[PDB]
Design a protein around this nucleic acid. Sequence first.
RNA 1: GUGAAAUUCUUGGAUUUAUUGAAGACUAACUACUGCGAAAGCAUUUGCCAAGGACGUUUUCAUUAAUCAAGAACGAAAGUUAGGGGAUCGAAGAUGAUCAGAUACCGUCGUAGUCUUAACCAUAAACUAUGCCGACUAGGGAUCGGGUGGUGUUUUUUUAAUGACCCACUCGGCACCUUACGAGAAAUCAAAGUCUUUGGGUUCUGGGGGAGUAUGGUCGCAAGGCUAAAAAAGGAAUUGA
RNA 2: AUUUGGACAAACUUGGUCAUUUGAGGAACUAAUUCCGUAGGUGAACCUGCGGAAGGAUCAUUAAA
Lengths: 283, 130, 127, 181, 240
Amino acid sequence: QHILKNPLVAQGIVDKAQIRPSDVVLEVGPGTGNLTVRILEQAKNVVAVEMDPRMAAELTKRVRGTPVEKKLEIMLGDFMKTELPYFDICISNTPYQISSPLVFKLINQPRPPRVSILMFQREFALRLLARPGDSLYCRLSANVQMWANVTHIMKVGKNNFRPPPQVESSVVRLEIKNPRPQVDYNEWDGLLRIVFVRKNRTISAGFKSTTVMDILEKNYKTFLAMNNEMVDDTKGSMHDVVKEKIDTVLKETDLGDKRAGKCDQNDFLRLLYAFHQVGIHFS
Amino acid sequence: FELSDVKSSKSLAEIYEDDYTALSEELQKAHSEISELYANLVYKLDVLSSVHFVPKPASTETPTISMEDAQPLYMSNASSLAPQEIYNVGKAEKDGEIRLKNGVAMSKEELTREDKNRLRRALKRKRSKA
Amino acid sequence: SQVFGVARIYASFNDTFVHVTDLSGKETIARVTGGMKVKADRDESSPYAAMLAAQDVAAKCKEVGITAVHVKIRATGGTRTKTPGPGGQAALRALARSGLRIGRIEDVTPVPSDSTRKKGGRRGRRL
Amino acid sequence: KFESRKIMVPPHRMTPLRNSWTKIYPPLVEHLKLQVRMNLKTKSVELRTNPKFTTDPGALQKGADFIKAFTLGFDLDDSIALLRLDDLYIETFEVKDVKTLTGDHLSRAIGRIAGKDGKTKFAIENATRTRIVLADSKIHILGGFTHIRMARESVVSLILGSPPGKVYGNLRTVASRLKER
Amino acid sequence: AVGKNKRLSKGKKGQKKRVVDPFTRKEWFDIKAPSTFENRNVGKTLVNKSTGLKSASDALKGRVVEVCLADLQGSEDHSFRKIKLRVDEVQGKNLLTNFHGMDFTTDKLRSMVRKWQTLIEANVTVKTSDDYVLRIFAIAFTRKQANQVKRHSYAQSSHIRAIRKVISEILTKEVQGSTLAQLTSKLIPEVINKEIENATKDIFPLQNIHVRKVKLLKQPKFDVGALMALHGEEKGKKVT
RNA sequence: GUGAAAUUCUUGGAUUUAUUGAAGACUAACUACUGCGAAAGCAUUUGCCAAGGACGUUUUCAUUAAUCAAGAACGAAAGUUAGGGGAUCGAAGAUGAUCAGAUACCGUCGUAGUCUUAACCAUAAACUAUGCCGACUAGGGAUCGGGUGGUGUUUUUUUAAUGACCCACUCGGCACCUUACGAGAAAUCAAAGUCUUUGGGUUCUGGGGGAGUAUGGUCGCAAGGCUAAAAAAGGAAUUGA
RNA sequence: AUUUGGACAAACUUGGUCAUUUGAGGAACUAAUUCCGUAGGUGAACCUGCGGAAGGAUCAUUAAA
């Protein structure tokens, strides 16, 4: 693993976590437990999750003897397949490979928390901070900028770890938008995949690919089948007649000749509304 | 261990014949060499620091005779072995029996309840001391 | 006098086929596989697999009555490796010890004149 | 019922064949009972077994593999070991069968396999109890099956570019566990 | 794997019982070579059944056997050469065969190719007087002289192109003047490479000149009379 | 199919054998311290179209030249737009196994791409990490192209080519081996040399690393604007009292 | 097709019934590699696709009969 070597950046994490004494905190990756004893001093309830039984025994032996062990709780096992209770603050120091699905689970969590202080790679932090018009704008960037508001906190050097890793790290803050904007996550996901299979081409060409037209043909066909009407007959392929349909929606929207790396959230919302109005559903 | 980047001085047939055939022989020969050198050194030092005449210690196949025999040569090895070291007593094999060090054997079924209790208490205080 | 069959020995990299056909390759007398002789998944590419394979194939071939065999070994060919493996050499030794009259040995490995890309990538296929 | 095999010899390995021929035919004629001719007009060696003088059937194939190993360029005592045992195998593969390399990089790859004065090569030899021969591109490994497998793993990692220090550490680890077993 | 820990798949749900008795219902047929070769009788092949005389006829008409000229002619010095024949007519457990193609062996080709000489390849297509559209590949290596002190013996591209011209003309002329049986009789005792060498002794001194490959490409109208003639009638036994 | 298995597909018989047919790529070994091109680059045959080096020349004009901003041409791979077919491999992506060990972290399918036409894009460790033109200063053999001479062997002879090897000389290349009466911090350098301090002609350029700090010198980016919880041996214990 | 009267009457509510299984007290008993250009990435202590570089450690055999 990797051991943290800066209680001053631990102070920074807590002070920007901005804890209220009525909260419960989901702490992922306690490690040796400096953050654990700090938020045990700060908040009302602490739920520390862990996959490593050796570090879990280390933390419980460091903490056994305090009066705040009545508030401390440690849950062992992988939390991506087990149940996680309600928490108001979420603080995470895990290796980032589980942290990206952690971000998506924390977004899709019922009654989502108020704020989350996470550690990430520098690249991954810039990926979350990627605004439209920037070269790092991607599918995950648009998803997090849709479902939440993210803001950078600080940058951590690779020399501030024992042993030092190869990728520079950062600490970021995620705030889920309450309430959730009532858009279908699956439809938004399908549209984002189709537009971001190549982020600098034209959206018209991204639809001009073949298998995307196969998927949209099957979707519109089953949509018209559950609505119980029939198409008009095509002289060639059904993929080609629904391609003509997407041509119509693209030349009424006038976004078909635009850059996917520059189209922001509002343009995607207008386009998916146009698809929902014409009868196209990506899921 | 450490590998040798030099060419192996034996072929595949030789290394497999070797595997087809004291921790190490070179180590044992090193022990012999250092022991004889130390014997020569202690001989020289006793020559220098002693008062009375001391001779040279020693000089450094076939059926051999050992002249000095550390037994009266009509004492069999089993007769030299003590009756304690060829059969001790221990905890018996079956879990239905307890066998103490004084030779008695007690089944777990023909006992009484207070006897079972005192045996448990004795084993408990023995375990607590250990 | 004797009668000749063609023993095509495909020594794959993780398998071994010992397929005996007649002349012209139309009628197949017998065919086995390394795993099918020895029930594992490591040992489907073993000299022991090849030995059991060639022994039972020589049994079936002598049952039909073919005394002599020309033998055509083969590697996997293609853009992969082009040399017959230890499984193939083991199968050949096992046939010679099983006692079919070996007539003539060939190595018909399909060598691409100018091959396409191979499965690896720019960094290298294995390990 | 006599039975015959033939086997070619390339000229660069025909000079050592003439040079050390007198230590090749005595095991073939004395312990294998195998009549040997050499056609210098076709640059080939012919092994014919006699119907009555020989005993074992596999003797002919063992002798053919013996001459084949010496032809591919192994040392005489090592090919004698191939004759002596019954489960020695020879494996061959190429640098373009691992990763396509273009010229100067291929030269440096063979340089990394060989090592300074054959150090890395003899390290692989002594570790996995095998014999390695590097031709122009084709490489040849002689030994037991699992041994040549592990040697192939180490060589392929060397081709892909693992430095000799790292691959030497892995050699001494696999040699430690192989000595323990 | 037939192990008990081999995880079952869709696979072996419904099998069949091994009762086909295949090498009792199958039948052996002897093939025979054209009269141009010395030892014609070679091997026996397997016909699937005899209920279908149509089946026997069609399978044996499709048969394409392959042999080597050493075993076909008794002289083991033709070890590297190899021919393919195809069977076209049957008569009572005996098959009449004709020529189909030729090849070397890959070990001979690899042993021919060396590292200090140039390789020259001629790749011609023709049609003999028997209307067999054919394709002939030949190779030739640029050897070094008896006085050569240079290491390599490379030929200039002009000499290469000139030798391709000469070899192409030689092959086309001889195999257009000849017929297919006459072509096989020319092809056996290596006379065509001798002619190529005798012609190109003045352009550049060569070695290992060989007609590497013959490939049939079209086949003319059938003639069982011509087959019987180039190979070299039968009554019953009054069953009752 | 991997180190190990598993998704996958196989009685309507897979993998394999034989005979073929189609498709689009690619041009193995031969392959060299060889060649061509201004560089990137260039390998099947044959034909066509133009172009070029070097040699040879008792041909021809007679300073027409060197270095040079602006601008122009060309510029690997990836990448964009619009067409084409799309076999192979395959950023993204979807999945199988997540088994200890990563010593020995993959497998299956596949969008874009790869390929081709027409236009953009103009960048690389695009390297001999070294402006160009001219001149002079060491020897040694090679190898490619051209030429001259001689000598034989292979060759062939009123037929359409008279080439191959040898040796000597010779230009012009790709390079190499020894060394400098030279240079230098030294590695090294036939140029990074041209007798101690300096002039053959000419375009461009200059006056180390991390750290700590101030920023008006500058470019960018944010959030919320109804929403709240209140001390424990009152232990441990198949190990105790 | 439809219709009359009975009995069986599934199933459901409201329960009554007995039967059989299934929360923490007390009360017992037993047992004890480095990089460059480019393109891209959501199980991202980095990875991948394409083309390049060494600024990355060369042993053995090799004229002819």
